[PDB]
Amino acid sequence: GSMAESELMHIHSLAEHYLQYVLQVPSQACRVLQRVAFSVQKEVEKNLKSYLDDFHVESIDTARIIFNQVMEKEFEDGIINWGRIVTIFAFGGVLLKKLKQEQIALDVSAYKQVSSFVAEFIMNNTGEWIRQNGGWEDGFIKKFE
């Protein structure tokens, strides 16, 4: 209730902090998440470079459309795990970097807009799973210890 609302706000903070990191905009889960999500983002940018070059992300709406279409396909089997969750943040960063390169409308707040749709997807698709699987401290961080 208030618990689901708190969960979404927490996910939003995680997403905002990750995306800020991605763009060098001025906690332990944040630190480890930033490192692993960025390692994924780098892998994607390097290995799927030609596919990423088939999109021009000229607007926030285009970013949202592509994010959702890709994520929907990724998650169509209904499988959730921390690996899957990490890839959502990563792909959000991938798209934010493209948006910053290709956006036509002046948008200095783009990472805020992207953080919102990324947080909504994470909450809507994986929010219950996260609380059922140890949360960020007793679930996600424990994967590295």
Binding site: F55, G83, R84, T87, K143
Partner: peptide, 22 residues
């Protein structure tokens, strides 16, 4: 086609992580 190969790569990467950490 591009969205499918991206999604499949993310699935593969997610799987790699899952297998490593379990």
């Amino acid at each position: 086609r591009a969205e499918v190969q991206i999604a499949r790569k993310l699935q593969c990467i997610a799987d790699q992580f899952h297998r490593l950490h379990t």
